[model samples]
Target chain A: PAQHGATTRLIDIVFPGDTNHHGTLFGGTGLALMDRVAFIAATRFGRTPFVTASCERIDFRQPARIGHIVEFTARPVKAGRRSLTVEVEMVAETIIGRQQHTCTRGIFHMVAIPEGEDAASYVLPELLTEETPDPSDAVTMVEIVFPDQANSAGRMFGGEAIAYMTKAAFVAASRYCGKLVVLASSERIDFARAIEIGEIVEAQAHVERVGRSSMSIQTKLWSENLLTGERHITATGHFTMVAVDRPATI
Target chain B: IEKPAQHGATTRLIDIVFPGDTNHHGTLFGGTGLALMDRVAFIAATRFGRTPFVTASCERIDFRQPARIGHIVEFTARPVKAGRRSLTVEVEMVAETIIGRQQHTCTRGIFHMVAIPEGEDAASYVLPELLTEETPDAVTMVEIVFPDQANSAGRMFGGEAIAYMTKAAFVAASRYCGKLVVLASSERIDFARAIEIGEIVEAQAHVERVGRSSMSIQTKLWSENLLTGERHITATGHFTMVAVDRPATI
Candidate 1:
């Protein structure tokens, strides 16, 4: 597959143990999964060892309660001499309503490293300029909501949107930051609709503003119907990300 | 009538690091390490109060060394002080490495914990006054060395022992603190020796010194042979705990 040709998708269910004290998925667990997907995308595209430079900003767009099936789709958006920026979108849905909502968006900057001393550094096939990439250029993902990702009332959990929003924000920020960037802070967040299990969700992210040392990224989440071609806006947020030297942190 | 003696219910949580838990540096991720410590601190605080408990604050979770995947990670927690209604817990993490048949305390920290009544609201809860006089032996445990807990050489892991003793210390300190307590800091830590598996492991902690607000707890770990009943000292350390109000942390 060509680099950034098609989005890679990861589907998972939210289990009881994955919830935080407040009955939503733990932010760290979400971060771990986002990193896992970023690693996979970087490894596949570059065929080289990669390292997380750092995590920039995480904003809560909505919650991923228990029992909700969540989907993460990652694809490369921009490339540096040694880095690949992957944008990820998280969607949570309910199995019953066939309703879907974009629950999260995340961004990750992965750096390519020599897998072996004699091995050549795997190169980025495409090095796009810092202009904001097409929103549709973002890889899309869809998933059903599972148990424990929602509340007992079957709604999106609190502070749940940050993981998803920050994910895609990372990509947009990286593209704007030039080399690579990690999320640093979240500027604003809003949860517009209740996310339920059995619904399908989608998200797209883009760079909204550029700062001296950072960039602001905006990600939008939605609930969609595959059969009906209908979609609902679910949540939105902006994440601030800071650029860093290679071999930094995420 | 005999007094209600304190029974140490130190939380002994042992985990094996897998490939997924490690960073590109091949060490345990900082966030995961922090999560583990928080889990133990929560366990220790909740167990101590009888009523539900939660962590209030955390500090000095110093990553003294990096723990690698496949390494056995052990953690222990103890209460270090008594506030009007809160207490502090000290937790220790140790890493067992097979390269040199070596084990060491890789990370350590103190967390503040709060105790609340069961009803979900603690706005007007009044806690009974606390008393402090019991010795370290009141909280002690004798455990058999499981295969995963120890190696074939029959040697007890240092990481395992430290966590065991750390749990003992938290229980005893919380028992004395009475209300909810939080962890502040730890000091006077040193490794004395390596104990054996199959042999029973025993740990006890003491309120070595006390100031107006802070309590210093010293702990010791020992291994005893079942046949000869000979006991050997393995590890020792001290922790400081303080008090806080319920609902201080969630």
Candidate 2:
């Protein structure tokens, strides 16, 4: 039997009135969802109560429009003493046909923390294996294309992209850490390209560097036009995570 | 005997924080801080029973420091000067950090407000008197020069300085016009130097030119290292505001 330990989740987001902003989902609101999903992934790795340390880079490739579905996926890349690196990706698909388009991708750095102590006091876990996931595998790739993700200009709000990208990273980090983690910091993001609504977005992440208490992960964002099958490289960036201890039992 | 013009007025605002306000960095997002400033300015102006206004332009909005989660952020707003049509409000943000205290010259800007009839359009209102007993005092002026306006990088956030300078201009314009004025547009802003975190910042605004229907205000931001008393000019900019009357009631 083929080695199978992959986990996938498909999140169907409707650009409902609550999510709409000037005809699309609010950027901050979308980010809130992304953060929730990423946190869930981190907790699965056994790290509890993780915090965000820093976000290195975020790039938005295309806008997620309203009336579309967004598929978000996460995977672990590296594990450290108290830190873990996770990779996340999002793609938008049309609701009518489920047609897919790559939207955005990025890395999330999360640290495993004890229940009560300061974040810096927690110890990180070691990776079970040094093997890397095959990039060519379709199972490792996910997509989200939701119509509600777009703005009035038919472009994705910068905040929405950032939130989705951040969530993707968090989910990936959590998959490896086996614990709950939190976001601590995000670096200044530079936007080099813009993603329009109705476009597919894809994201990929991998570990770049690992330290005793911290780790860095790199992410890449790409876009594919379903109508023409044309793909464009959109954005790329990195993130850092640290492990910490939770509070002590009474 | 002629009464000398009153130059400054100070006010306090209730500080509040919400979940949506946090960024991926686990701190208050820069944009949210500005939103708060906008609200405070609006409320302060409303206290004067002046006509309703909109933000025409914003100058020198700097995030010299970051606000952490679960921290109480304080904001102080003061009218440095008021003219016939516009007034400038300056604000400050401070956070309690593990390393003593960290103060951020979070945002500074000049607000031009135009007076209007109770139900008339803003463009149809006449100017009103700006002089009030609640004007700022010399002590408030001295307190504006707080340490920590400087940063670790030794450069003030360019936006921070611009906000202060704009406030200075708003004050002068409001006082000279003796009525409500609306911000029209902002010219180019030049960042002369960097003011680092943990340094005192000074924002000053003044009228540059007054026209029949419009006025130009200039703002300047300066920084001083409290530990060493070293000071530097951080940034400067100019804004234009217009005066309008409320629609004539039939």
Candidate 3:
């Protein structure tokens, strides 16, 4: 069962050390926090050994700056056989003049695996059929899988793919719940495509269903041919996220 | 003559990236990498010039790859060029995977630093230059005998005397080169008498000898009773300094 609109919320203040020489928030740093919050959401919801399986699409529009207060909201948007999708949205505010702007939105796919080698025996929450969010509300993420994000096969590393997809899921869940959120599990993250550098991955994250405190999100990844720019769906994933009240930092 | 070290003055800083340093995406946060880069660059410049230096600007930094957690991140900083008022420090970051011991180029950054007098602000750009040819100027510094500068017995501390005398030598070397310098060795230190409270201390530094990229300075200290108008050659010492065209073992 899912609450009506449960979510996870994370906040960070940009410090001197958090900025680049240009005094701006580095993109990787921002993504790191987004992924971190998504992980925490999943861990708290499932109370199991969950790992980041993938991220959907993460679209960063405006950049956050030093001295800005950025807020991250994540929530469950979908449930899978053994996983969950957390959608997250971020906004930054400058206190002096009270200027605010949207920063990023994405989705994270988290998987629930057993502590030992019995992950097959693991049981997630029962799936519930429900209506999905509007198509216009879907968030799309674009990426370039460079050698740094490559595996031994000269293709995008599975780990790196999951990492970006996680952010995509995070954004979707956050927007769906519009509140603080956490991740639970992800399942059925099938990587049917192998792409190398210049492989433009276009990922989309959207809410497919919701339970009392959980959400079901579906994410799809497409590869765009560089010269033609024709995109084709190559990877599809399922994620389950859960909304949570602010937990006291213990 | 702005002679940046022809041969790169190199310094290496090595460390392991922990979970705390990575984004939830399982890679290093760009902020952490930038911080490490800046640190190494500052050290290299400090080593080369021996004058107090501050970063004017970072020319550019490019992230070629993502460094993951548990990777051994090593930073190499070298002085590449020099100007009349500033010098260029180029920093290279490398990440080595712990599993297969494979190394990857992570990033590179160009930083510019300007020399300034110690304790002076950036607004004050011009600084006194160090001597390369002659011992024309005498080192002068005034200190009031306070409780902190004295021993438990209320007399000038032995370590304080050595420290004060060494500073004079440091000043001598720094001014001689108009660059950053550090203490190298000490030959002989002679203390004449125990100076008491309310004493005005003046340290005098003299050029003993000069060598390529190094200098020898003899320092003498005198203390005067403010109320009694009494003074004496309270301490004497010889110190050696080297021009830091490159990082030294010390």
Q: Please provide, for model 1 over B49-76, each residue's C-alpha lDDT reduced to its tens digit, 9 standing for 90 to 100.
A: 5444444445533344343423446677
lDDT of residue A164 for candidate 2: 49
Fnat (0 to 1) per candidate: 0.00, 0.00, 0.00
Ranking by lDDT: 3, 1, 2
Off by over 4 Å in 2: A1-149, A184-188, A226-228, A246-250, B1-250
lDDT of each: 0.55, 0.47, 0.60
lDDT of 3 by residue, B108-144 (tens): 6777766554444446444223222222327565444
lDDT of 2 by residue, A1-250 (tens): 1122233343534421223331332244444445544544554454365665544465654444433446566555666776667666666654334456446665777766566556566554444543455553121233444544442234443334544444445444433343322333344344455566655565565555556654454556565553334577666645454433331111
- DockQ by candidate, in order: 0.02, 0.02, 0.02
Per-candidate TM-score, chain A: 0.45, 0.43, 0.48
Q: Model 3, A200-249: lDDT tens per residue?
A: 56668899988877777788877765434456766676766665443211
lDDT of model 1 at position B58? 52
Question: Candidate 1's residue-wise lDDT over A69-166, tens digit each?
Answer: 45667777878767788887767653223246456778888887765565574466674433444656453444434443332234433233334444
RMSD (Cα, Å) for all candidates, in order, is 19.9, 22.4, 24.1
